[PDB]
Amino acid sequence: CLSKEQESIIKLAENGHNIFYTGSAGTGKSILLREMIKVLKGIYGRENVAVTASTGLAACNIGGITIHSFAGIGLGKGDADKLYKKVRRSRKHLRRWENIGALVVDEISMLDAELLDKLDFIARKIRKNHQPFGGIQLIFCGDFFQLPPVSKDPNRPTKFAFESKAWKEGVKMTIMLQKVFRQRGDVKFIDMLNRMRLGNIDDETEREFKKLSRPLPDDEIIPAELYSTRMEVERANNSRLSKLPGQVHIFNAIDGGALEDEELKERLLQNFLAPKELHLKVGAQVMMVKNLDATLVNGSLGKVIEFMDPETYFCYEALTNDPSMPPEKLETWAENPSKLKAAMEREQIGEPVSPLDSSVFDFMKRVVLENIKRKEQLMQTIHQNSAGKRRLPLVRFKASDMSTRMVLVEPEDWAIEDENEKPLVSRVQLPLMLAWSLSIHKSQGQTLPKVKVDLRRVFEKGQAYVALSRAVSREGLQVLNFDRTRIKAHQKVIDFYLTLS
DNA sequence: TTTTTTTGGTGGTGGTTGTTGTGGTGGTGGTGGT
Ligand SMILES: Nc1ncnc2c1ncn2[C@@H]1O[C@H](COP(=O)(O)OP(=O)(O)O)[C@@H](O)[C@H]1O
Ligand code: ALF
Ligand SMILES: [K+]
Ligand SMILES: [K+]
Ligand SMILES: [K+]
Ligand SMILES: [Mg+2]
């Protein structure tokens, strides 16, 4: 049901142009990108379109992965020549760069000039091809009135992308969307945001946002919550978890790394994104933070169903997807776990095991011949035999393709490197974090019809604008600590947008 | 104040980094593995 404007951008891409297209929050940029990818893939081949964004959550929104994950450059910090050498070792990433025909990059506002220039070097060098990006077709999408790249604060609204040599030679074409969809119900709200987008906040606009400080309805819809800093986010996530009914399950990380200063180690540990102490409950909302396979990536959203050991989960999964599931099969595995292990492997202590929440057996429930749910009492027995085995969270993850894949999530390992690649710090922990609340950075690209926003710690230009334009309706938005002095837009972006009509 | 991540050969400034190689479609490495 794409608009006249959206379809012409898709059709322009068919003609082979290297395009950047843009528009205010909620103009339908990502919804259009999703559809565009199908036709680029039909032109180039299923495996030959790189779909990428600046953050994990924004990449998942269009079925892709982070530009960093795609390129194979790690953090991509060093000289272009060093990154290229890292890339050319890894067979997956070198072949990817040689074979792809198109590179899709969403939320481009968060990509700094150095990365584009280095990426240009990499594509030119790998493909033996002096075209702007080795000839890869470029589709760039985002809004530079939103967040700039993440940096600290020497003198760094880091030169944005439009200042990169790679950009000026590569980007052939720009397209601007104008119609705001996200907030379409509320024209006064849309006008307030777009002027807020440009850093032009008047008194009357300020009055209306300060009016939205009233609390949200206590209704069963759990709100999204947005904060500037990870510390704010963790407090909001842990609060919501404590309101959930249920026994807490504690997962303490295993940390290491061959550095003598314990404090220095902890500084490096903070940026691993998986918590030291992961607390989960049945019903907890979680986010995947590691790239495990093709459709389970950083940004995948899920809900904890229960906690089971691998033997129990094999039975749970098979009971799911059952032709009719004669309860005899479950019984064989119950009294003879040696047969469960073989069955499981054919396809490949002092703490009481709490029984499974009855909600996890609801899928079979939606005539006493078939209402004999002995399997529920059979599944509970098999689970009880897991006393003294590790019980992992079963999470229903939802991918960008609308699939609802159930995964019993095992611990993974993280490591960082040096100027070269010696590991400084390493951790083993589940690749999960609570995700009712989101940082404003990772929220960028999301649509949040019920959201609380606390602007108390906003610092970068455009951050306040990003947070409020996630909302759909004013009735579903609360804003705390709005301050107009913290919303001024970057003049370089105002100027750049002047060559656009 | 915030984001970004890692198998194999089209490296060798390292095995303390290989259950990540119980490898070999690599050689400007050798405290690793056969
Ligand atoms: N043509 C359209 N018709 C109806 N709704 C749309 C259309 N385009 C976008 N939307 C809605 O607008 C919201 C934001 O769109 P999105 O593609 O995320 O914009 P952006 O990526 O620019 O923020 C989505 O929830 C989507 O449902
Ligand atoms: F610019 Al957006 F969601 F991608 F507001
Ligand atoms: K090696
Ligand atoms: K060797
Ligand atoms: K080797
Ligand atoms: Mg988008």
Residue A499 included in any domain: no
Is the domain of A139 the same as that of A16?
A: yes
Contact between A197 and A41 under an 8 Å Cβ cutoff? The reply is no
* CA neighbor of A454 nearest in space, from A180, A224, A117, A187: A224
- A90 CB closer than 7 A to any strand B atom: yes
Q: How was this structure determined?
A: X-ray
Contact between A315 and A344 under an 8 Å Cβ cutoff? The reply is no
Helix or strand or coil: residue A295? Answer: coil
Is the domain of A132 the same as that of A13?
A: yes
Residue A294 included in any domain: yes
Is the domain of A148 the same as that of A246?
A: no
* CA neighbor of A452 nearest in space, from A483, A477, A482, A481: A477
Contact between A436 and A236 under an 8 Å Cβ cutoff? The reply is yes
* CA neighbor of A428 nearest in space, from A413, A406, A407, A409: A413
Nucleotide with the nearest C1' to A291 CA: B5
Is the domain of A82 the same as that of A21?
A: yes
Residue A500 included in any domain: no
Helix or strand or coil: residue A67? Answer: helix
Residue A498 included in any domain: no
- Long-range pairs for A149-157: beta carbons < 8 A, 24 or more residues apart: A149/A54, A149/A109, A149/A110, A149/A111, A149/A112, A150/A110, A150/A441, A151/A112, A157/A460, A157/A461, A157/A490, A157/A492
Closest atom, ligand 2, to C-alpha of A445: 3
Residue A494 included in any domain: no
Number of domains in chain A: 4
Q: How far apart are CA A11 and CA A13, in angstroms?
A: 5
Is the domain of A28 the same as that of A158?
A: yes
* CA neighbor of A164 nearest in space, from A121, A107, A114, A124: A114
Residue A169 included in any domain: yes
Q: How far apart are CA A26 and CA A495, in angstroms?
A: 22
DSSP E strands in A209-360: the ranges are 224-227, 249-252, 254-256, 277-280, 285-288, 301-308
Helix or strand or coil: residue A496? Answer: helix
Contact between A386 and A374 under an 8 Å Cβ cutoff? The reply is no
- A170 CB closer than 7 A to any strand B atom: no
Q: How far apart are CA A459 and CA A487, in angstroms?
A: 9
Closest atom, ligand 2, to C-alpha of A146: 1
Beta strands A412-415 and A173-177 are unpaired
Q: Which residue has the tokens 């909600």?
A: A359
Residue A475 has φ and ψ, to the nearest 5°, of: -65, -25
Is the domain of A83 the same as that of A173?
A: yes
Is the domain of A214 the same as that of A239?
A: no
- A89 CB closer than 7 A to any strand B atom: yes
Looking at residue A251, what DSSP letter applies? E
- A273 CB closer than 7 A to any strand B atom: yes
Beta strands A412-415 and A426-429 are antiparallel
Residue A464 included in any domain: yes
Separation of first and last alpha carbons in chain A: 26
Q: Give me the CA A395–C1' B17 separation in Å, rounded.
A: 32
Q: How far apart are CA A203 and CA A199, in angstroms?
A: 13
Alpha helices in A217-304 (DSSP H): 230-243, 262-270
Contact between A180 and A190 under an 8 Å Cβ cutoff? The reply is yes
Is the domain of A10 the same as that of A63?
A: yes
Is the domain of A69 the same as that of A165?
A: yes
- Listed as ranges, the nucleotides of chain B within 7 A of a protein C-beta are 1-11, 13-14, 16-17, 20
- Long-range pairs for A150-155: beta carbons < 8 A, 24 or more residues apart: A150/A110, A150/A441, A151/A112
| Residue A304 token pair | 């904890």
| Residue A96 token pair | 């990817």
Q: What is the CATH number of the domain that holds A15?
A: 3.40.50.300
Ligand showing the shortest atom-to-Cα distance for residue A421: 3
Residue A172 included in any domain: yes
* CA neighbor of A497 nearest in space, from A174, A181, A179, A182: A174
Range of the domain at A83: 4-177
Nucleotide with the nearest C1' to A93 CA: B7
Is the domain of A345 the same as that of A359?
A: yes
Beta strands A137-141 and A224-227 are unpaired
Closest atom, ligand 2, to C-alpha of A143: 1
Is the domain of A102 the same as that of A16?
A: yes
- A55 CB closer than 7 A to any strand B atom: yes
Find the residue closest to B2 using CA and C1' atoms. A150
Of the three residues A141, A158, A177, the one that is the final residue of a domain is A177
Q: How far apart are CA A422 and CA A290, in angstroms?
A: 21
Q: Which of residues 399-418 of A touch strand B (CB under 7 A)?
A: 414-417
Q: How far apart are CA A348 and CA A351, in angstroms?
A: 30
Is the domain of A238 the same as that of A376?
A: no
